[PDB]
Amino acid sequence: DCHLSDMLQQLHSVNASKPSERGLVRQEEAEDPACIPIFWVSKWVDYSDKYGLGYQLCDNSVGVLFNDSTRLILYNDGDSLQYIERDGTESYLTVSSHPNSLMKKITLLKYFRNYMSEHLLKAGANITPRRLPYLRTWFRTRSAIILHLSNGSVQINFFQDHTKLILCPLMAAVTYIDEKRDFRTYRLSLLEEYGCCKELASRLRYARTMVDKLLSSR
């Protein structure tokens, strides 16, 4: 796939520049507003033992990648749906149309929505952004969950300190959410030029290994 291999080269480039080892790091000069992401995952629920993975995007739409490799998205109007078949065929319908064949999946998505609404907090709820994607694939390690969106964006959420990266290969940009929920969006090639802090550098090193894993899968 194109977007992942571009992302890999982009990450390699920044990491090969050893950006945290500059005399003076000038991270702020690498900031670029035109590169702020439009979509990212604000909440997620791993029910992969039985059903699949539920998630909410920053616009309050919710999606599920089911164990059977199909996907369902509920738009933030709370009635419109997009169903994506195993083979990639997408169709639009409504919850209120009550399609008997999809009622199980609709019920499961509503459960995920309701659970995330009452029991999880929204990630990146303060971000000012600059079609809706679905979750292509995901996996987790001991320290992070990795989410690959259909627009090419890769998001990595670190468990131990609540930090997050949103990587976009189209904009060649990374958005970093630190422990304080402070966020900044950087052009990768400008990080090469101006440097960055040790903690973003280490997470970009981790990100590269994660993109390797996604590619070797694929």
Side-chain angles (χ1 to χ4, degrees), residues 1-84 88-103 105-135 137-141 143-181 183 185-197 199-217:
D1 170 73
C2 265
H3 292 141
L4 286 178
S5 62
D6 294 334
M7 190 178 293
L8 185 73
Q9 188 49 65
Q10 284 162 15
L11 288 167
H12 173 80
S13 289
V14 52
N15 297 349
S17 79
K18 278 164 272 143
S20 72
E21 298 196 49
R22 305 308 159 81
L24 174 70
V25 163
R26 307 203 287 123
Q27 207 163 335
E28 64 276 357
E29 306 279 15
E31 291 181 18
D32 197 359
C35 288
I36 301 170
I38 298 149
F39 294 107
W40 64 89
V41 174
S42 56
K43 303 182 185 187
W44 61 269
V45 178
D46 184 352
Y47 213 135
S48 63
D49 282 356
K50 201 163 205 255
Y51 300 119
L53 186 119
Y55 63 91
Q56 177 204 74
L57 299 181
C58 54
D59 80 333
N60 307 320
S61 61
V62 296
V64 178
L65 170 49
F66 291 104
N67 285 358
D68 69 5
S69 274
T70 53
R71 289 166 272 255
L72 193 68
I73 298 83
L74 177 70
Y75 293 87
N76 64 15
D77 78 339
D79 190 42
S80 306
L81 294 161
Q82 184 189 339
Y83 185 52
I84 305 156
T89 316
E90 64 184 40
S91 53
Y92 302 80
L93 65 165
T94 200
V95 176
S96 46
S97 67
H98 197 275
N100 285 163
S101 58
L102 286 172
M103 280 325 288
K105 291 173 163 170
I106 289 161
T107 305
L108 284 170
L109 185 37
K110 308 262 263 192
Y111 168 77
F112 278 119
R113 188 204 48 196
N114 294 349
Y115 178 88
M116 293 183 288
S117 175
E118 252 269 69
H119 299 290
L120 306 171
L121 307 183
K122 183 157 167 181
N126 44 328
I127 300 165
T128 54
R130 75 175 186 260
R131 83 168 76 251
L132 203 131
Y134 55 90
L135 183 67
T137 199
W138 69 278
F139 68 89
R140 54 149 127 186
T141 59
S143 45
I145 185 157
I146 292 83
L147 311 157
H148 182 25
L149 301 177
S150 59
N151 59 7
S153 284
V154 169
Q155 177 167 336
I156 301 156
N157 293 13
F158 293 88
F159 302 135
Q160 297 161 217
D161 66 356
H162 307 266
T163 64
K164 293 166 186 76
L165 290 179
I166 306 155
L167 290 156
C168 169
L170 298 161
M171 299 293 139
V174 57
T175 299
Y176 177 40
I177 300 179
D178 66 29
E179 51 272 66
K180 314 169 208 70
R181 292 181 275 245
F183 61 96
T185 304
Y186 303 101
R187 231 189 279 171
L188 270 334
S189 68
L190 290 189
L191 292 184
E192 284 171 38
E193 182 158 17
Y194 295 111
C196 68
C197 66
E199 45 218 304
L200 177 57
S202 74
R203 287 155 182 79
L204 293 167
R205 263 179 260 121
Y206 195 76
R208 187 270 168 78
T209 302
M210 300 304 102
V211 176
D212 273 323
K213 289 179 177 287
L214 288 173
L215 267 161
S216 57
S217 294

Short mmCIF file of all heavy atoms in Angstrom, two decimals, residues 45-100, unseen atoms left out:
data_model
loop_
_atom_site.label_atom_id
_atom_site.label_comp_id
_atom_site.label_asym_id
_atom_site.label_seq_id
_atom_site.Cartn_x
_atom_site.Cartn_y
_atom_site.Cartn_z
N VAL A 45 -13.21 1.05 22.20
CA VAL A 45 -13.53 -0.12 23.04
C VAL A 45 -13.14 -1.43 22.33
O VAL A 45 -13.66 -1.75 21.26
CB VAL A 45 -15.03 -0.16 23.44
CG1 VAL A 45 -15.34 -1.40 24.27
CG2 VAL A 45 -15.43 1.09 24.21
N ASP A 46 -12.22 -2.16 22.94
CA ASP A 46 -11.79 -3.46 22.45
C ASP A 46 -12.73 -4.55 22.99
O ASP A 46 -12.64 -4.92 24.16
CB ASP A 46 -10.34 -3.73 22.87
CG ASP A 46 -9.78 -5.04 22.32
OD1 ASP A 46 -10.53 -5.84 21.72
OD2 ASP A 46 -8.55 -5.27 22.47
N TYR A 47 -13.64 -5.02 22.14
CA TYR A 47 -14.48 -6.16 22.47
C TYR A 47 -14.16 -7.26 21.45
O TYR A 47 -15.06 -7.93 20.93
CB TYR A 47 -15.96 -5.74 22.40
CG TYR A 47 -16.89 -6.42 23.39
CD1 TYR A 47 -17.83 -5.68 24.10
CD2 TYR A 47 -16.83 -7.81 23.58
CE2 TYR A 47 -17.68 -8.52 24.47
CZ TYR A 47 -18.64 -7.88 25.23
OH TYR A 47 -19.45 -8.59 26.09
N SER A 48 -12.88 -7.44 21.15
CA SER A 48 -12.44 -8.30 20.05
C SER A 48 -12.56 -9.80 20.33
O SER A 48 -12.54 -10.62 19.41
CB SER A 48 -11.00 -7.96 19.63
OG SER A 48 -10.09 -8.20 20.69
N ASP A 49 -12.69 -10.15 21.61
CA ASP A 49 -12.92 -11.54 21.99
C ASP A 49 -14.23 -12.12 21.45
O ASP A 49 -14.35 -13.34 21.31
CB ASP A 49 -12.88 -11.68 23.51
CG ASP A 49 -11.45 -11.69 24.05
OD1 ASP A 49 -10.49 -11.67 23.26
OD2 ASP A 49 -11.29 -11.73 25.29
N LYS A 50 -15.20 -11.26 21.14
CA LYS A 50 -16.54 -11.71 20.76
C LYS A 50 -17.09 -10.98 19.53
O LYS A 50 -17.60 -11.63 18.61
CB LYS A 50 -17.48 -11.57 21.97
CG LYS A 50 -18.73 -12.42 21.90
CD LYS A 50 -19.38 -12.57 23.26
CE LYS A 50 -20.21 -13.84 23.32
NZ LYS A 50 -21.67 -13.58 23.24
N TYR A 51 -16.98 -9.65 19.50
CA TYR A 51 -17.66 -8.84 18.49
C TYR A 51 -16.74 -8.05 17.56
O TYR A 51 -16.84 -8.16 16.34
CB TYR A 51 -18.66 -7.89 19.17
CG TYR A 51 -19.73 -8.60 19.97
CD1 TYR A 51 -19.86 -8.37 21.35
CD2 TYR A 51 -20.60 -9.49 19.36
CE1 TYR A 51 -20.85 -9.03 22.10
CE2 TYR A 51 -21.59 -10.16 20.09
CZ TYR A 51 -21.71 -9.92 21.46
OH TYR A 51 -22.68 -10.57 22.17
N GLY A 52 -15.85 -7.26 18.15
CA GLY A 52 -14.92 -6.46 17.38
C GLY A 52 -14.45 -5.26 18.16
O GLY A 52 -14.49 -5.23 19.39
N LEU A 53 -13.99 -4.25 17.43
CA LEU A 53 -13.52 -3.02 18.04
C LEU A 53 -14.45 -1.86 17.70
O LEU A 53 -14.68 -1.54 16.52
CB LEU A 53 -12.09 -2.71 17.61
CG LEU A 53 -11.61 -1.49 18.41
CD1 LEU A 53 -10.40 -1.80 19.27
CD2 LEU A 53 -11.45 -0.28 17.52
N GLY A 54 -14.99 -1.23 18.74
CA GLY A 54 -15.80 -0.01 18.57
C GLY A 54 -14.95 1.24 18.77
O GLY A 54 -13.98 1.25 19.55
N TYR A 55 -15.30 2.31 18.06
CA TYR A 55 -14.55 3.57 18.17
C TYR A 55 -15.46 4.75 17.87
O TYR A 55 -16.50 4.61 17.20
CB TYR A 55 -13.32 3.55 17.25
CG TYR A 55 -13.68 3.45 15.78
CD1 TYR A 55 -13.88 4.60 15.02
CD2 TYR A 55 -13.88 2.21 15.16
CE1 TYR A 55 -14.25 4.52 13.68
CE2 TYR A 55 -14.25 2.12 13.81
CZ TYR A 55 -14.42 3.29 13.08
OH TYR A 55 -14.77 3.23 11.75
N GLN A 56 -15.08 5.91 18.40
CA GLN A 56 -15.75 7.15 18.09
C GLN A 56 -14.75 8.12 17.46
O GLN A 56 -13.61 8.24 17.94
CB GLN A 56 -16.35 7.73 19.37
CG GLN A 56 -17.03 9.08 19.22
CD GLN A 56 -17.05 9.81 20.54
OE1 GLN A 56 -16.02 10.33 21.01
NE2 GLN A 56 -18.21 9.83 21.17
N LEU A 57 -15.15 8.78 16.37
CA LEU A 57 -14.32 9.83 15.77
C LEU A 57 -14.59 11.18 16.43
O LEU A 57 -15.58 11.33 17.15
CB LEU A 57 -14.55 9.92 14.26
CG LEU A 57 -14.19 8.65 13.47
CD1 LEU A 57 -14.43 8.86 11.96
CD2 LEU A 57 -12.75 8.19 13.74
N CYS A 58 -13.71 12.15 16.20
CA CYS A 58 -13.81 13.47 16.82
C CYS A 58 -15.13 14.23 16.53
O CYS A 58 -15.45 15.18 17.24
CB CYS A 58 -12.63 14.33 16.38
SG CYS A 58 -12.48 14.41 14.60
N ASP A 59 -15.87 13.82 15.50
CA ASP A 59 -17.16 14.44 15.17
C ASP A 59 -18.38 13.72 15.81
O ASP A 59 -19.53 13.99 15.45
CB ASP A 59 -17.34 14.52 13.65
CG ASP A 59 -17.79 13.19 13.03
OD1 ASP A 59 -17.48 12.12 13.61
OD2 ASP A 59 -18.47 13.22 11.99
N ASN A 60 -18.12 12.82 16.76
CA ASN A 60 -19.16 12.04 17.47
C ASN A 60 -19.86 10.94 16.67
O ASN A 60 -20.77 10.26 17.18
CB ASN A 60 -20.19 12.96 18.16
CG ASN A 60 -19.54 14.00 19.06
OD1 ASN A 60 -18.58 13.72 19.77
ND2 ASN A 60 -20.06 15.22 19.02
N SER A 61 -19.44 10.73 15.43
CA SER A 61 -19.81 9.51 14.71
C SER A 61 -19.12 8.34 15.40
O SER A 61 -18.06 8.50 16.06
CB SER A 61 -19.37 9.56 13.24
OG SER A 61 -17.97 9.70 13.13
N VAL A 62 -19.72 7.16 15.29
CA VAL A 62 -19.14 5.96 15.86
C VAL A 62 -19.05 4.87 14.81
O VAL A 62 -19.91 4.79 13.92
CB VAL A 62 -19.89 5.47 17.12
CG1 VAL A 62 -19.78 6.51 18.24
CG2 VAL A 62 -21.36 5.17 16.80
N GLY A 63 -18.00 4.07 14.89
CA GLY A 63 -17.84 2.96 13.97
C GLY A 63 -17.47 1.69 14.70
O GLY A 63 -17.07 1.70 15.87
N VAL A 64 -17.60 0.57 13.99
CA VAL A 64 -17.16 -0.72 14.49
C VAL A 64 -16.53 -1.51 13.36
O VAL A 64 -17.09 -1.62 12.26
CB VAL A 64 -18.31 -1.56 15.09
CG1 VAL A 64 -17.79 -2.93 15.56
CG2 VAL A 64 -18.99 -0.85 16.24
N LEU A 65 -15.35 -2.07 13.63
CA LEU A 65 -14.79 -3.09 12.76
C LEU A 65 -15.11 -4.42 13.43
O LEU A 65 -14.53 -4.76 14.46
CB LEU A 65 -13.28 -2.87 12.53
CG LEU A 65 -12.44 -3.96 11.83
CD1 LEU A 65 -13.07 -4.49 10.51
CD2 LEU A 65 -11.01 -3.47 11.57
N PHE A 66 -16.07 -5.14 12.85
CA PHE A 66 -16.49 -6.42 13.41
C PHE A 66 -15.47 -7.52 13.14
O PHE A 66 -14.75 -7.45 12.15
CB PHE A 66 -17.86 -6.83 12.85
CG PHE A 66 -18.98 -5.96 13.32
CD1 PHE A 66 -19.53 -5.01 12.47
CD2 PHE A 66 -19.47 -6.07 14.62
CE1 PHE A 66 -20.57 -4.20 12.90
CE2 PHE A 66 -20.50 -5.26 15.06
CZ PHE A 66 -21.05 -4.32 14.20
N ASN A 67 -15.45 -8.54 14.01
CA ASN A 67 -14.61 -9.73 13.81
C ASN A 67 -14.75 -10.40 12.42
O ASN A 67 -13.79 -11.00 11.92
CB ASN A 67 -14.86 -10.75 14.92
CG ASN A 67 -14.22 -10.34 16.25
OD1 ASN A 67 -13.54 -9.30 16.34
ND2 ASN A 67 -14.42 -11.15 17.28
N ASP A 68 -15.93 -10.27 11.80
CA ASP A 68 -16.15 -10.87 10.47
C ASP A 68 -15.60 -10.02 9.33
O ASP A 68 -15.90 -10.26 8.15
CB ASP A 68 -17.64 -11.18 10.26
CG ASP A 68 -18.49 -9.92 10.12
OD1 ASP A 68 -17.95 -8.79 10.09
OD2 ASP A 68 -19.73 -10.07 10.03
N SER A 69 -14.82 -9.00 9.68
CA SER A 69 -14.22 -8.07 8.72
C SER A 69 -15.21 -7.17 7.98
O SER A 69 -14.89 -6.66 6.91
CB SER A 69 -13.30 -8.80 7.73
OG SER A 69 -12.00 -8.94 8.26
N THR A 70 -16.40 -6.96 8.53
CA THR A 70 -17.28 -5.93 7.99
C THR A 70 -17.25 -4.72 8.90
O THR A 70 -16.83 -4.83 10.06
CB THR A 70 -18.74 -6.39 7.84
OG1 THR A 70 -19.20 -6.91 9.09
CG2 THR A 70 -18.87 -7.48 6.77
N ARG A 71 -17.72 -3.59 8.39
CA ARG A 71 -17.70 -2.35 9.14
C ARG A 71 -19.04 -1.64 9.10
O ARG A 71 -19.72 -1.63 8.07
CB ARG A 71 -16.61 -1.43 8.61
CG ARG A 71 -15.21 -1.92 8.96
CD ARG A 71 -14.16 -1.20 8.15
NE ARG A 71 -13.93 -1.88 6.88
CZ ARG A 71 -12.86 -2.62 6.60
NH1 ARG A 71 -11.89 -2.79 7.49
NH2 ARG A 71 -12.76 -3.19 5.41
N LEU A 72 -19.39 -1.02 10.21
CA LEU A 72 -20.59 -0.21 10.30
C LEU A 72 -20.29 1.15 10.93
O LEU A 72 -19.56 1.24 11.93
CB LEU A 72 -21.68 -0.97 11.05
CG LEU A 72 -23.13 -0.46 10.99
CD1 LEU A 72 -23.74 -0.60 9.60
CD2 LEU A 72 -23.98 -1.18 12.03
N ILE A 73 -20.82 2.20 10.31
CA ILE A 73 -20.61 3.56 10.80
C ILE A 73 -21.95 4.20 11.04
O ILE A 73 -22.84 4.13 10.18
CB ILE A 73 -19.83 4.43 9.79
CG1 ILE A 73 -18.43 3.87 9.54
CG2 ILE A 73 -19.75 5.87 10.28
CD1 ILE A 73 -18.38 2.75 8.51
N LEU A 74 -22.09 4.84 12.20
CA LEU A 74 -23.28 5.61 12.52
C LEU A 74 -22.89 7.08 12.55
O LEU A 74 -22.03 7.50 13.34
CB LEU A 74 -23.87 5.18 13.88
CG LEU A 74 -25.09 5.98 14.37
CD1 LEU A 74 -26.36 5.70 13.53
CD2 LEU A 74 -25.37 5.71 15.86
N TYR A 75 -23.51 7.86 11.66
CA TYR A 75 -23.22 9.30 11.60
C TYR A 75 -23.77 10.03 12.81
O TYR A 75 -24.61 9.49 13.55
CB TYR A 75 -23.68 9.92 10.29
CG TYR A 75 -22.91 9.42 9.09
CD1 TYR A 75 -23.31 8.27 8.43
CD2 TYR A 75 -21.76 10.07 8.64
CE1 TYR A 75 -22.62 7.77 7.34
CE2 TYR A 75 -21.04 9.58 7.53
CZ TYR A 75 -21.49 8.43 6.89
OH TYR A 75 -20.83 7.90 5.80
N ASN A 76 -23.28 11.24 13.04
CA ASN A 76 -23.60 11.94 14.28
C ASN A 76 -25.03 12.51 14.31
O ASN A 76 -25.44 13.12 15.30
CB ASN A 76 -22.53 13.00 14.61
CG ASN A 76 -22.46 14.10 13.58
OD1 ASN A 76 -23.35 14.26 12.75
ND2 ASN A 76 -21.39 14.89 13.64
N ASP A 77 -25.79 12.28 13.23
CA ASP A 77 -27.23 12.55 13.24
C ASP A 77 -27.98 11.46 14.01
O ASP A 77 -29.15 11.64 14.36
CB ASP A 77 -27.80 12.73 11.83
CG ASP A 77 -28.01 11.40 11.09
OD1 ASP A 77 -27.38 10.37 11.44
OD2 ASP A 77 -28.80 11.41 10.12
N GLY A 78 -27.30 10.34 14.24
CA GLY A 78 -27.81 9.26 15.10
C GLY A 78 -28.75 8.29 14.40
O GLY A 78 -29.28 7.37 15.04
N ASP A 79 -28.96 8.50 13.10
CA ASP A 79 -29.85 7.63 12.31
C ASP A 79 -29.19 7.12 11.03
O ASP A 79 -29.47 6.00 10.62
CB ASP A 79 -31.19 8.34 12.00
CG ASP A 79 -32.24 7.40 11.41
OD1 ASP A 79 -32.38 6.24 11.87
OD2 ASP A 79 -32.95 7.83 10.47
N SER A 80 -28.32 7.91 10.40
CA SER A 80 -27.70 7.49 9.14
C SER A 80 -26.56 6.48 9.35
O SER A 80 -25.75 6.63 10.27
CB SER A 80 -27.17 8.69 8.35
OG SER A 80 -28.18 9.65 8.16
N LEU A 81 -26.52 5.46 8.50
CA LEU A 81 -25.52 4.41 8.57
C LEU A 81 -24.78 4.23 7.25
O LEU A 81 -25.34 4.46 6.16
CB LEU A 81 -26.17 3.06 8.90
CG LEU A 81 -26.83 2.78 10.24
CD1 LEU A 81 -27.74 1.58 10.04
CD2 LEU A 81 -25.80 2.51 11.33
N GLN A 82 -23.54 3.76 7.37
CA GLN A 82 -22.77 3.27 6.23
C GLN A 82 -22.29 1.87 6.58
O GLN A 82 -21.61 1.66 7.61
CB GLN A 82 -21.59 4.21 5.93
CG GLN A 82 -20.78 3.84 4.69
CD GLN A 82 -19.50 4.66 4.57
OE1 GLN A 82 -19.36 5.73 5.14
NE2 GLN A 82 -18.56 4.14 3.81
N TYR A 83 -22.68 0.91 5.76
CA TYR A 83 -22.24 -0.47 5.91
C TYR A 83 -21.22 -0.80 4.84
O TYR A 83 -21.45 -0.56 3.65
CB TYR A 83 -23.43 -1.43 5.83
CG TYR A 83 -23.09 -2.89 6.11
CD1 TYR A 83 -22.40 -3.26 7.28
CD2 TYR A 83 -23.50 -3.89 5.24
CE1 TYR A 83 -22.10 -4.60 7.54
CE2 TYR A 83 -23.21 -5.24 5.49
CZ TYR A 83 -22.51 -5.58 6.64
OH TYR A 83 -22.23 -6.90 6.90
N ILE A 84 -20.10 -1.36 5.25
CA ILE A 84 -19.06 -1.74 4.30
C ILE A 84 -18.87 -3.24 4.36
O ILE A 84 -18.51 -3.79 5.40
CB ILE A 84 -17.76 -0.97 4.57
CG1 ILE A 84 -18.06 0.53 4.58
CG2 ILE A 84 -16.66 -1.36 3.54
CD1 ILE A 84 -17.10 1.36 5.34
N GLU A 85 -19.16 -3.92 3.25
CA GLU A 85 -19.11 -5.38 3.20
C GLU A 85 -17.67 -5.88 3.25
O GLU A 85 -16.72 -5.09 3.14
CB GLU A 85 -19.82 -5.90 1.94
N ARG A 86 -17.50 -7.19 3.43
CA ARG A 86 -16.19 -7.83 3.43
C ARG A 86 -15.34 -7.41 2.23
O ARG A 86 -14.17 -7.06 2.39
N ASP A 87 -15.95 -7.42 1.04
CA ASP A 87 -15.25 -7.13 -0.21
C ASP A 87 -15.09 -5.64 -0.53
O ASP A 87 -14.58 -5.29 -1.59
N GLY A 88 -15.53 -4.77 0.38
CA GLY A 88 -15.35 -3.32 0.20
C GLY A 88 -16.53 -2.57 -0.39
O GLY A 88 -16.47 -1.34 -0.52
N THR A 89 -17.60 -3.29 -0.73
CA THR A 89 -18.85 -2.68 -1.21
C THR A 89 -19.50 -1.87 -0.08
O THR A 89 -19.85 -2.44 0.96
CB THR A 89 -19.88 -3.76 -1.64
OG1 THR A 89 -19.24 -4.78 -2.42
CG2 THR A 89 -21.01 -3.14 -2.46
N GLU A 90 -19.66 -0.57 -0.28
CA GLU A 90 -20.34 0.26 0.72
C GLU A 90 -21.75 0.70 0.32
O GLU A 90 -22.00 1.08 -0.83
CB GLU A 90 -19.48 1.44 1.18
CG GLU A 90 -19.15 2.47 0.13
CD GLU A 90 -18.22 3.55 0.66
OE1 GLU A 90 -17.27 3.23 1.42
OE2 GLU A 90 -18.44 4.73 0.31
N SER A 91 -22.67 0.63 1.28
CA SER A 91 -24.04 1.10 1.08
C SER A 91 -24.48 1.97 2.24
O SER A 91 -23.94 1.87 3.35
CB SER A 91 -24.99 -0.09 0.95
OG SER A 91 -24.82 -0.97 2.04
N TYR A 92 -25.45 2.83 1.97
CA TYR A 92 -26.00 3.73 2.98
C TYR A 92 -27.44 3.36 3.29
O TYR A 92 -28.22 3.01 2.39
CB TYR A 92 -25.91 5.18 2.51
CG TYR A 92 -24.49 5.59 2.22
CD1 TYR A 92 -23.88 5.25 1.01
CD2 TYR A 92 -23.73 6.30 3.17
CE1 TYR A 92 -22.57 5.61 0.73
CE2 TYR A 92 -22.41 6.68 2.89
CZ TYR A 92 -21.84 6.32 1.67
OH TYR A 92 -20.54 6.68 1.37
N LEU A 93 -27.79 3.44 4.56
CA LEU A 93 -29.16 3.18 4.99
C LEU A 93 -29.42 3.89 6.30
O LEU A 93 -28.59 4.68 6.76
CB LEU A 93 -29.41 1.69 5.12
CG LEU A 93 -28.67 0.85 6.17
CD1 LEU A 93 -29.38 -0.49 6.31
CD2 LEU A 93 -27.19 0.65 5.88
N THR A 94 -30.58 3.62 6.89
CA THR A 94 -30.93 4.30 8.11
C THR A 94 -31.28 3.28 9.21
O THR A 94 -31.80 2.20 8.90
CB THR A 94 -32.07 5.34 7.81
OG1 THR A 94 -32.12 6.33 8.84
CG2 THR A 94 -33.40 4.70 7.68
N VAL A 95 -30.97 3.61 10.46
CA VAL A 95 -31.40 2.74 11.59
C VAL A 95 -32.93 2.59 11.63
O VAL A 95 -33.45 1.49 11.74
CB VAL A 95 -30.91 3.28 12.97
CG1 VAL A 95 -31.47 2.41 14.12
CG2 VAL A 95 -29.39 3.31 13.03
N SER A 96 -33.64 3.71 11.47
CA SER A 96 -35.10 3.69 11.51
C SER A 96 -35.76 2.86 10.39
O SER A 96 -36.94 2.54 10.49
CB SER A 96 -35.66 5.12 11.54
OG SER A 96 -35.02 5.95 10.57
N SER A 97 -35.01 2.50 9.34
CA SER A 97 -35.56 1.63 8.28
C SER A 97 -35.71 0.20 8.78
O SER A 97 -36.43 -0.61 8.18
CB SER A 97 -34.71 1.68 7.01
OG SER A 97 -33.43 1.11 7.22
N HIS A 98 -35.06 -0.08 9.91
CA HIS A 98 -35.07 -1.38 10.59
C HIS A 98 -34.77 -2.57 9.65
O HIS A 98 -35.63 -3.42 9.44
CB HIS A 98 -36.40 -1.58 11.35
CG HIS A 98 -36.35 -2.67 12.38
ND1 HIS A 98 -36.57 -4.00 12.07
CD2 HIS A 98 -36.11 -2.63 13.71
CE1 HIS A 98 -36.46 -4.73 13.16
NE2 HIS A 98 -36.19 -3.93 14.17
N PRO A 99 -33.55 -2.62 9.07
CA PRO A 99 -33.18 -3.76 8.23
C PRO A 99 -32.94 -5.00 9.09
O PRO A 99 -32.03 -5.01 9.92
CB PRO A 99 -31.88 -3.30 7.56
CG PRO A 99 -31.28 -2.35 8.56
CD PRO A 99 -32.44 -1.65 9.19
N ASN A 100 -33.77 -6.03 8.90
CA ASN A 100 -33.69 -7.23 9.73
C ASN A 100 -32.32 -7.87 9.71
O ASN A 100 -31.82 -8.31 10.74
CB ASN A 100 -34.75 -8.27 9.32
CG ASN A 100 -36.17 -7.89 9.78
OD1 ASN A 100 -37.16 -8.43 9.26
ND2 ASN A 100 -36.28 -6.96 10.73
#
